[PDB]
Structure formats: C-alpha cells, structure tokens
Design an enzyme around this catalytic site. Structure first.
Site, PDB file in Angstrom:
ATOM      1  CG  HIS A  75      -2.123  -0.971   0.994  1.00 49.72           C
ATOM      2  ND1 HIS A  75      -2.347  -2.015   1.863  1.00 49.72           N
ATOM      3  CD2 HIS A  75      -3.069  -1.074   0.033  1.00 49.72           C
ATOM      4  CE1 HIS A  75      -3.388  -2.714   1.450  1.00 49.72           C
ATOM      5  NE2 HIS A  75      -3.844  -2.164   0.341  1.00 49.72           N
ATOM      6  CG  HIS A  79      -2.137  -0.530  -4.460  1.00 47.77           C
ATOM      7  ND1 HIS A  79      -2.457  -1.692  -5.125  1.00 47.77           N
ATOM      8  CD2 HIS A  79      -3.288  -0.085  -3.905  1.00 47.77           C
ATOM      9  CE1 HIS A  79      -3.741  -1.949  -4.968  1.00 47.77           C
ATOM     10  NE2 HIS A  79      -4.269  -0.991  -4.231  1.00 47.77           N
ATOM     11  CG  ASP A 116      -5.608   1.824  -0.773  1.00 48.96           C
ATOM     12  OD1 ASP A 116      -6.664   1.790  -0.108  1.00 48.96           O
ATOM     13  OD2 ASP A 116      -5.175   0.826  -1.382  1.00 48.96           O
ATOM     14  CG  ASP A 245      -8.398  -2.097  -4.364  1.00 47.52           C
ATOM     15  OD1 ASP A 245      -7.428  -1.325  -4.265  1.00 47.52           O
ATOM     16  OD2 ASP A 245      -8.762  -2.830  -3.426  1.00 47.52           O
TER      17      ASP A 245
HETATM   18  N1  LIG Z   1      -3.056 -10.963  -4.176  1.00 48.29           N
HETATM   19  C1  LIG Z   1      -3.608 -10.572  -3.024  1.00 48.29           C
HETATM   20  N2  LIG Z   1      -3.641 -11.461  -2.011  1.00 48.29           N
HETATM   21  C2  LIG Z   1      -4.215 -11.079  -0.877  1.00 48.29           C
HETATM   22 CL1  LIG Z   1      -4.228 -12.280   0.376  1.00 48.29          CL
HETATM   23  N3  LIG Z   1      -4.786  -9.928  -0.553  1.00 48.29           N
HETATM   24  C3  LIG Z   1      -4.738  -9.068  -1.579  1.00 48.29           C
HETATM   25  C4  LIG Z   1      -4.173  -9.302  -2.818  1.00 48.29           C
HETATM   26  N4  LIG Z   1      -4.294  -8.184  -3.629  1.00 48.29           N
HETATM   27  C5  LIG Z   1      -4.924  -7.322  -2.872  1.00 48.29           C
HETATM   28  N5  LIG Z   1      -5.223  -7.787  -1.625  1.00 48.29           N
HETATM   29  C6  LIG Z   1      -5.920  -7.071  -0.554  1.00 48.29           C
HETATM   30  C7  LIG Z   1      -7.251  -7.692  -0.205  1.00 48.29           C
HETATM   31  C8  LIG Z   1      -8.398  -7.346  -0.912  1.00 48.29           C
HETATM   32  C9  LIG Z   1      -9.595  -7.998  -0.641  1.00 48.29           C
HETATM   33  O1  LIG Z   1     -10.847  -7.874  -1.198  1.00 48.29           O
HETATM   34  C10 LIG Z   1     -11.074  -6.949  -2.275  1.00 48.29           C
HETATM   35  C11 LIG Z   1     -12.231  -6.065  -1.706  1.00 48.29           C
HETATM   36  F1  LIG Z   1     -13.217  -6.852  -1.196  1.00 48.29           F
HETATM   37  F2  LIG Z   1     -11.771  -5.322  -0.663  1.00 48.29           F
HETATM   38  C12 LIG Z   1      -9.665  -8.991   0.327  1.00 48.29           C
HETATM   39  C13 LIG Z   1      -8.524  -9.342   1.054  1.00 48.29           C
HETATM   40  C14 LIG Z   1      -8.554 -10.452   2.043  1.00 48.29           C
HETATM   41  C15 LIG Z   1      -9.669 -10.682   2.844  1.00 48.29           C
HETATM   42  C16 LIG Z   1      -9.657 -11.736   3.739  1.00 48.29           C
HETATM   43  N6  LIG Z   1      -8.621 -12.567   3.891  1.00 48.29           N
HETATM   44  C17 LIG Z   1      -7.551 -12.345   3.119  1.00 48.29           C
HETATM   45  C18 LIG Z   1      -7.473 -11.318   2.195  1.00 48.29           C
HETATM   46  C19 LIG Z   1      -7.334  -8.666   0.781  1.00 48.29           C
HETATM   47 MG   LIG Z   2      -8.241   0.417   0.473  1.00 53.01          MG
HETATM   48 ZN   LIG Z   3      -6.277  -0.328  -2.773  1.00 55.12          ZN
END
Ligand SMILES: Nc1nc(Cl)nc2c1ncn2Cc1cc(OCC(F)F)cc(-c2ccncc2)c1
Ligand SMILES: [Mg+2]
Ligand SMILES: [Zn+2]
Length: 338
Positions: A75, A79, A116, A245
């Site tokens: 972040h 990003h 962000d 995102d």
């Molecule tokens: N490649 C990635 N792997 C993981 Cl583990 N998290 C990521 C990734 N790229 C963005 N995020 C951040 C993120 C976004 C998300 O959802 C998108 C929106 F709904 F916000 C959910 C989680 C997340 C939620 C619960 N457990 C683990 C990860 C993490």
């Molecule tokens: Mg955010």
């Molecule tokens: Zn973001």
C-alpha cells in the site's frame, strides 16, 4: 511535458494491459503516480473538464503521492498508480465507453488515485482492535476508506494551489464529490458480496435476458436506457473500482508474483505486531512462520477474484485479464511439487 527519458520510455505503452509498473516505480524513484497521473489525466482531458491548470494538477498529484507511505510494501503510491492504470484501461473499453458519462470517468480516475491515501500498512480490524486514532474517529466503521476519502478532500481544498476542483460549477462539484466518495467507500472489503451481487442482479442478468430478443435497434435502445440510469452507473462504477483495486492476479505472471509478495509481507508484519503486543490475531494464516504464499493466493483467487472478474468479464469482455488469471492460477498450483 519535458519528462526525463527512462520515465518517458517506462510510460510508452500505458494503454496496453501488459505494462511495467515496477520499472516506472524504479525509474521514478518511488514517484510513479505523479508521472502516470499527468499522462492519464491529460490523455482523458481531465483538467479541460475541471478547468484546472497543468500546474494545479502537478501540485495535486504531488501532495497526495507524498501522503502514500513508502515504507509500506504493498500500500504505497505504486499500488495507486497500478490501480489507476487498470481503471483507465477499463474506462477505455467499448462497453464502459458507451455506458458511463464524462463526469464518471473523472470520478473513476480520481478515486483510483486517492483510494488508499495515508494507508498505514494495516487492516481496519487491526485499528479497531488496537483502538487507533482513526478507529475512534470513524467509530470502527470503514475506518481507512473514510480516512482515504476525507484526507484527499482535506489536502485538495485545504490549499489553493492543490485545489483541482476550484473552477467547477457548484452542482458539478457536488455530483463529482459524491461519485468519488462512493467509489472510495466501495473498496471496503466487508461489502464485497453486497457489491458483486448487486452487479449480477441489476446488470448481467437483465442484460442476458434482453440478449434473447436478438440484435435489434429498438432492443439496443432499451438496453442503453436501462444501463445508463444513475443507479446502474453507480453499480458499474463500484464494480470497476473494485476490480481495478484487486487486478494484480490478472496481470502478467512476473507482476502477479511481485504483488503477492508485497501484500503477503505487509500481512506478515501486522501479524508480528499483533503477537508482540498481544492483540487478537485477525489473519492467523498470514504469518511468516507458517504461510504458504502459493496456497494463500489460490484461496484468495477462489473466494474473491474468480466470481467478481467472471461477472466483470461477462459485461466488458476482458480475455487478456482472464487468460492471465488462468496462467497465474496454474502457476500457483505448479509450485506444490510434493
Ligand atoms: N493478491 C492478493 N492477495 C491477498 Cl491475500 N490480498 C490481496 C491481494 N491483492 C490485494 N489484496 C488485498 C485484499 C483485498 C480484498 O478484497 C477486495 C475487496 F473486497 F476489498 C480482500 C482481502 C482479504 C480478505 C480476507 N482474507 C484475506 C485477504 C485482501
Ligand atoms: Mg483500500
Ligand atoms: Zn487499494
């Protein structure tokens, strides 16, 4: 206008999905957003719409990028530039081009840039459990999403040289402000399935129903009238910001891997800080001493990415994203080997 050569070459093919966002990051010296923002906003003609100068845009891009924490693995301002790049790419597709209006494109590009800002490398649940200043300020409710949007408007309108909205109509700004806020708030993880299901039920299913009638000029106008309502545009905007995102698993494998490492490391850090302080562990699986990054990515793709991008793809037709999504999913599976 007068850009240095490596950064100019780094931004050569920014309309293409395959784009070297880390070369831009390296070449700009952790300042990818100002350079990529200037090109994107100029290409879309954002200051022509908002009546800002190029100088007010440079001042704006700088102050928001400055408030992205370089010490964050994932972040950081890179990003935001990555998420900005995917947003532009989705806006440039024919489906979105013939559905959204100019004021939505501006809301999308700005929302991507700020979404962000001042992220502390920590989840909302960390801040709520820890009793952070923002968690007390926003009452444990969309704590960072509220802050990202709020601070972005505090920094924009709080200085005259940073105010890109200063020369707008009162009603145009109020509409644009609402659209930016909504898209930034729509990135909160807790509302994922609420926003995916609204997109399926209000856009994909009704559009698939009207597809049975056949390609007719009267039928296209009914499809056009239904989709272009203020509500469905809001639902498309929310889906678009959401997909951009978390578009990293749909990138070229090299970039996909790099993004997985950064986000994982950021969650390993939080888990180390939770253990040291004695906070309740919100992400137990994301510990540096136990976590399989390949398995955790496969799980991440199954729970959030697969159904969301399937729906977005069915609307926009994104074969390159879904082809990268298959190759990257298969790569994560290939690393087991025993
Ligand atoms: N490649 C990635 N792997 C993981 Cl583990 N998290 C990521 C990734 N790229 C963005 N995020 C951040 C993120 C976004 C998300 O959802 C998108 C929106 F709904 F916000 C959910 C989680 C997340 C939620 C619960 N457990 C683990 C990860 C993490
Ligand atoms: Mg955010
Ligand atoms: Zn973001």
């Amino acid at each position: 206008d007068d850009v240095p050569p490596r950064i100019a070459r780094a931004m050569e093919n920014e309309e293409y999905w395959d784009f070297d966002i880390f070369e831009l990051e390296a070449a700009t010296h952790n300042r990818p957003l100002i350079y990529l923002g200037l090109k994107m906003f100029a290409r879309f003609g954002i200051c022509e719409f908002l009546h800002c100068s190029e100088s007010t845009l440079r001042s704006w891009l700088q102050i928001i990028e400055a408030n992205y924490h370089s010490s964050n693995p994932y972040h950081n301002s890179t990003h935001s530039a990555d998420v900005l790049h995917a947003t532009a790419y989705f806006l440039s597709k024919e489906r979105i081009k013939e559905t959204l209006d100019p004021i939505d494109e501006v809301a999308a590009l700005i929302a991507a840039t700020i979404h962000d800002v001042d992220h502390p490398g920590r989840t909302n649940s960390f801040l709520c459990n820890a009793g952070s200043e923002l968690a007390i300020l926003y009452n444990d409710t969309a704590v960072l999403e509220s802050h990202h949007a709020a601070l972005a408007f505090q920094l924009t309108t709080g200085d005259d040289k940073c105010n890109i909205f200063k020369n707008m109509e009162r009603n145009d700004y109020r509409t644009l402000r609402q659209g930016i806020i909504d898209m930034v708030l729509a990135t909160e993880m807790t509302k994922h399935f609420e926003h995916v299901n609204k997109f399926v039920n209000s856009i994909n299913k009704p559009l698939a129903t009207l597809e049975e009638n056949g390609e007719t000029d009267k039928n296209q106008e009914v499809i056009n009238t239904m989709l272009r309502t203020p509500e469905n545009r809001t639902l498309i905007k929310r889906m678009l910001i959401k997909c951009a995102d978390v578009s990293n698993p749909c990138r070229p494998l090299q970039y996909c891997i790099e993004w997985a490492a950064r986000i994982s490391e950021e969650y390993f850090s939080q888990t180390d800080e939770e253990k040291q302080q004695g906070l309740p562990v919100v992400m137990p699986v994301f510990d540096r001493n136990t976590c399989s990054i390949p398995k955790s990515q496969i799980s991440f793709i199954d729970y959030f990415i697969t159904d969301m991008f399937d729906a977005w793809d069915a609307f926009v037709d994104l074969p390159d994203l879904m082809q990268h999504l298959d190759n990257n999913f298969k790569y994560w599976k290939g690393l087991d080997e025993m």
